[PDB]
Amino acid sequence: LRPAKIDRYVDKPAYTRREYIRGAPGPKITIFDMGNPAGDFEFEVSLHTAEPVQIRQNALEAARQQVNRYLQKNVGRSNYHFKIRVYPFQVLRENPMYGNGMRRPFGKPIGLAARLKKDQKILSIRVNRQHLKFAIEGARRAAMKFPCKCYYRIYDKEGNDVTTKILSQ
Amino acid sequence: VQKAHSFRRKTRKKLSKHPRRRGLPPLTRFLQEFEVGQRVHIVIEPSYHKGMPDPRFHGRTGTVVGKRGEAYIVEIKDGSKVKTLFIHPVHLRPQK
RNA sequence: AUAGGAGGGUGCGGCCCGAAAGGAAUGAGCCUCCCCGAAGGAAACCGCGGCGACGCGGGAGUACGAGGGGAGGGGACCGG
RNA sequence: AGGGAAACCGACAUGCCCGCAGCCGGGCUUAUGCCCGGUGAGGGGCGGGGUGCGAAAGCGCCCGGAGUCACGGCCGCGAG
RNA sequence: CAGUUCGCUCCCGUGACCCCGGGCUAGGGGUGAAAGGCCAAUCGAGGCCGGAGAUAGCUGGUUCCCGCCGAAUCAUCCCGCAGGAUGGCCUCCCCGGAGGUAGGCGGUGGGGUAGAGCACUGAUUGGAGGUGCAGGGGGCGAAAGCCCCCGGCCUCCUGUCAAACUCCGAACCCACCGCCGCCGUAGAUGGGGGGAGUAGGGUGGCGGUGUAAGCCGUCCACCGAGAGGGGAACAACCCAGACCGGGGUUAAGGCCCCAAAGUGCCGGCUAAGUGUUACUCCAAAGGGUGUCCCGGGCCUUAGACAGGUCGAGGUCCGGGGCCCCGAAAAUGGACGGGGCUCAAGC
RNA sequence: CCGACACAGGUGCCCCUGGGUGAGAAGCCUAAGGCGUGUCGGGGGAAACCCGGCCGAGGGAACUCGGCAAACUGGCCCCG
RNA sequence: CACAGGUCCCAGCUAGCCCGAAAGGGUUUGUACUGGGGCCGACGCCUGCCCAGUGCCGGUAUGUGAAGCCCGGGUACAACCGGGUGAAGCACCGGUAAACGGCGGGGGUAACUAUAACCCUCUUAAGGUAGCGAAAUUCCUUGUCGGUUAAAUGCCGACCUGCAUGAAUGGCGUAACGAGGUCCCCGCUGUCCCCGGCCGGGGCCCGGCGAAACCUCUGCCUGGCGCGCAUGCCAGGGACC
RNA sequence: CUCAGGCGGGUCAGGAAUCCGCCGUAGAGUGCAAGGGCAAAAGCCGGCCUGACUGGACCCGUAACAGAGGCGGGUCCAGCCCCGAAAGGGUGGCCUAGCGAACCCCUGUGCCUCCCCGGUGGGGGCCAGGGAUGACAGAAAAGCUACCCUGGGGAUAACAGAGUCGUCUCGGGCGAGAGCCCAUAUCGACCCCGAGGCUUGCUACCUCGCUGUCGGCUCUUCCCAUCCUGGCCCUGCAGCAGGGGCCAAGGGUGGGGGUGUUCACCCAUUAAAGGGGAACGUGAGCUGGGUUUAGACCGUCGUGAGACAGGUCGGAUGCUAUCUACCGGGGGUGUUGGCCGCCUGAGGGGAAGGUGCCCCUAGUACGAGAGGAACAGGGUGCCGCGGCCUCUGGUCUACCGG
RNA sequence: GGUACGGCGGCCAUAGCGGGGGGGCCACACCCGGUCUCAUUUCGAACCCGGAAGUUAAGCCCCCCAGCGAUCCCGGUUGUACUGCCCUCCGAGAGGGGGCGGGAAGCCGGGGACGCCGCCGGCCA
């Protein structure tokens, strides 16, 4: 696994058309909804990036496992809904290099990543009042796994920002 | 890889019609007439394949200097050279 | 014989040479005084504004100013 | 005197239009000069003509006289 | 001493032994117990003179001064890729005689990039409803077929995409016309002729590619082919494009000393020598009751917090400015140097 | 004599050799014969260092790619 | 490399092989116990299979096969066209490997455990026999085991999994021989621990003869800029000749 | 005339044979890729035909602007025709690919021509079609060089420098967990952010009118990411020891076996037997074992010459120091007149010192036992440095003896 | 000049899809029958020929709507996203920012929209 700083930035054009990309790998993350999506919840904690960035599927899966384990241990399966809103479409390639360097250097697919704009939500955890601290801790744990600065916000059912109200209360 | 210019090279969007304009065009453009010295725009109609000039000249404004058969003789200034084209009136539009 | 840059460039100072071919006793460097003057251009002092550095009106487009002319003194250098 | 591979054939000493310089007439301007209208060499464009290809139309080349010789110079090609 | 010698050590030393005089074998030839060895200091084809001043797209050189104008390394073709040809760009001369268009305004047309979106094409999380739908799994029946789960296919909701998607769509660019502006009878636009050089470009912004450096194009601004004044020195960065002798004022930027110009002024911040860096050079994720501030909630001047008693503001959160930790390299030393703390830093 | 030389090479050591020791035309000394011209001299605890040579306590290859170099043995007689 | 020894090939003489433009010639004042042409290389024991390929030799019934000749057409004559005859050489057939070369590859077993070839299936011209083998041939490799040392990428012995050994481009062994490469033992020693003395010649000074290589001009440093490792540039440091 | 697909209904007949109805913007088809275009058609089904023809003109593209042989395409005039009632269309395929100079040759056609003239056979010329050059704007065409030679090239590789850090070395953020409970005594998954230039790679910026390679020996110096020595903190630290971390670069970090080796492995000691930079420090200091010429052998590959980042034996190391640099040794000037003697010490240099072991504390603290410290106090070895010749040893070309 | 009449057209969805009500002087249709003209790869179903027994059920004509599709205007998101020129403005980088000039797409709310226009003829007057 090469360092994520290589694929962190978004200066390259979008590379997603599976009809023309030869040898594109299959996704490594297959679960995007956990908990009880049907049940309603008063509050939702969303995680946003502070800058445009490509987040790898490995980082997405690691954050998913960590947050899901924490929420299962502390809150309970029927008391939360954890969702990842983004899907890895960008295909990350690498130059395949006896041996010729820089000759015919177009890369072959090696992984997948999700490209995100500025202030775009990555994941959401829907909980009630009594599990807000656990939701915030899970959001922080997820943010610790990503290659960019991230911040959390709290929204009510109507969609208004109430993070300051909730944290002060 | 260098690619030589052809008649239909890189004309995917230039020579494509609107979905609501598919089919035969109205006959006014087909039957329109011009006088010598009149200035006309070149708007190629993709459905009509007769008397079509090179798509490189699509969108340019020329002057009518004659008429041969059913096609009009249009003069354009490509750089400093004078270029003569035989364009069907369906591919032409009057200026103003 | 306490001083650093390819050995030169600009300006001048110290020492030295300076008959002819350059100027010059029909007057040299030098000293004093008077007139005009482009672009530019102060200050003393008075009045006022600003927390302050400071600025504004008068003085004043004055003193001065590249250069262009004139008069007096002295008597051998100036250019190189 | 050109056209054509060849046989071979064989053309405006100006019919017309536009028009610069020059010339002529008029108006303004102190003058220079500007404007309007004619005539306009050279210049441009038609019309007509010789020939080759064509059944023909039609196209290519050519047609209303400027060439030739010398001195000097630049350049291309071959010779070291 | 010597264009292969000297010393010590070593080997053969009656044999296929060593040496001398007279002869023969001559250059694609001789000779070779075969190393391409030897053939007069020369041998994978000797030497001398001649062809001959051979040829090269490769290396080097090319001699006085002033004046005017002043490039290019980009397209097509070549057994073409260190070389040529046709064009583009430069220069000199002439014909012709009234228009021309680098900039702008308005107008008549063209476009599908950025952005955005799911209406086609292809992707994409979960849920609800419909459809037995040729699927599978069980139970279930002699056999005709049922009952569920899952799967497939449609509609809706929910959460996401596209260089080789577009129901939309800029900035902007291009063609033409009228006008403003500028150039032109002291002759432009244009046409004819003579002579070239140029076929390695670089920096910078943008695009594709690459971990990056870099590679490949594009834009024509600067170096190339450019002085002077600055960035400490610098090709490219800033001012600025330059005949000669003088005077003055400004430009980049600078004013503690080096070093011309203020230890200049008002308000605030920093205590780390952080900094003293416009750019050619400059370290991050994660943290800090370190300080200076803004906004929003709860209690809230003997009703708050800390330890029913005191008796004045505490409690939390999200942010902004400077600074701190994170922070290890080899000759002795780099804010240009000295040094600088209500600064000579921000 | 040839090699550019009054060249430590090659041509020619091509032919010849008194005494002692000794197997010996070996090494060493010496007679005859020749030379002091294998041609710059003088000084010196006058060094370091280099070339050539002698010796080295205890250990005995631990050196090194490798006992390189050096060192041990050495002639003759008798057993084996 | 040569060598004595082994073996193969051509040749009965106006031969075989070779020089040359030819004339003539070398072998040759020679005659198969000879002349010429390859390969191996004393000596001892041996030298297995393959002629499909490429070479060489013999045959060549048959096909093709140039000129010349003959026949028909054509040309008032020719050029030209068609056919027949048709040598050598190829096609074809046979010998030849001490001629050039080659001598393979998958499954399962005999489970008195497991693992081996007796064994049955494609396959070629045939599938490497006797010997030797981690080799001057072994990539993995410093193979594994044993001996040598306190310690062994060495050396010797053995095993065989021979990447890619092998029988006259010879196989194996071998006394004597060797300034050939290689390992060990006794002895020896300044190779070393660890260097110290002494001698002669240079070096050094004095009197003489008297050059050459080389030389843009010059010539101190640290950190930097720079065509990317500066005596000469920038900022500093130091320095009498 | 209208397709693909779907729905509902039908004898065998079912998922799928043929048929009726409805929805159906093309979701079909159009010879073949893709793009574009096509619905009373350019698609499907039929009728009649050969315009896939002859003689010519102009224009666009390859090849913008801006030059072009050959080729492709478009707009037309005339002739002879085809379909249609007519309008109208037809110079191949709905548009964009499916292809080619000179010379020579073959064919069609109807003209000109061959040296004084005429006839015949034959030849030459003009127009049209065809045979191909795929390196496709058009040579006919296999290799080795390590015996190599020449002209050049930092326009271009290997060593070294430079840029970069994917890789390498070394850290950091979070904490699933493993640890009898306990994430942080210790290890720390999945992810994420870095530093160094000590491994390798990438680029081709300096250097091809030469900057001499690996390893070893000799010698000097520097960094800390510290192996030991000095001082500390946490512990799943009883003691003796261990594990993790902090300050600290004054000193030390050694001897041997195979191998050319660096490295790695092994042996006996030791407090420990650290990693690196200095042109992978150091060949005008050495050696020449490996690598990398010319000789030769083996194996494999090749018909062969020959080749192998495959082994193997042999295979040259030039110097009179010009400047500067360092080590020591001298002559001068200056230091406001000259000379002799004794002093001061601004600055520079040092490691002048470093480190083991033994006795005792003490069989004590600690500990169930086994085992087993420390402060203080004494002694001594080794490495390093500066001196000396009384003792011992070496030499002693003075000297004495055999 | 009137007509809930027709023919030929222009723009080619603000005009289409789907619904509700009304109408036939004339005219347009549905409809009746296949000898003749013409045709079925069968079928007078289409096309064609000859007509007016019946019907306004629908094609057609007139009025209306906003469920779908499309599209014009106004307000919010919003001068948001994006962008031309200059810069000694900040940022480690990514990128951002200041001045002057332009400026969306989508979504939400309220209106619009069930076409407009040209030539001629028929019938009545």
Helix-strand blueprint:
The structure is cut from a larger assembly and holds chains A (169 residues) and B (96 residues).
Chain A: E1 33-35, E2 43-49, E3 53-56, H1 57-74, E4 81-84, E5 90-94, E6 108-116, E7 121-127, H2 132-143, E8 150-155, H3 163-168
Antiparallel strand pairs in A: 1-4, 2-7, 2-8, 3-6, 4-7, 5-6
Helix pairs in contact in A: 1-2
Chain B: H1 27-31, E1 39-42, E2 61-68, E3 71-78, E4 81-87, E5 92-94
Antiparallel strand pairs in B: 1-2, 1-5, 2-3, 3-4
Chain A binds 7 RNA strands through helix 1, helix 2 and helix 3.
PDB class: ribosome
Keywords: RNA modification, cryo-EM, ribosome
Entry title: Structure of P. furiosus 70S ribosome grown at 95 degC
Question: Which percent bin holds the helix content of chain A?
Answer: 10-25%
Shape of chain B: globular
Strand line-up of the largest beta sheet of chain A: 1-4-7-2-8
Strand content of chain A: 25-35%
Q: What's the SSE pattern of chain A?
A: EEEHEEEEHEH
Task: State the helical fraction of chain B.
Answer: under 10%
Largest sheet features of chain B: 5 strands, antiparallel
Terminal Cα separation of chain B, in Å?
43 Å
Pfam family, one (chain B): Ribosomal_L21e
Family (chain B): Belongs to the eukaryotic ribosomal protein eL21 family.
GO molecular function, one term (chain B): structural constituent of ribosome
Organism (chain B): Pyrococcus furiosus (strain ATCC 43587 / DSM 3638 / JCM 8422 / Vc1)
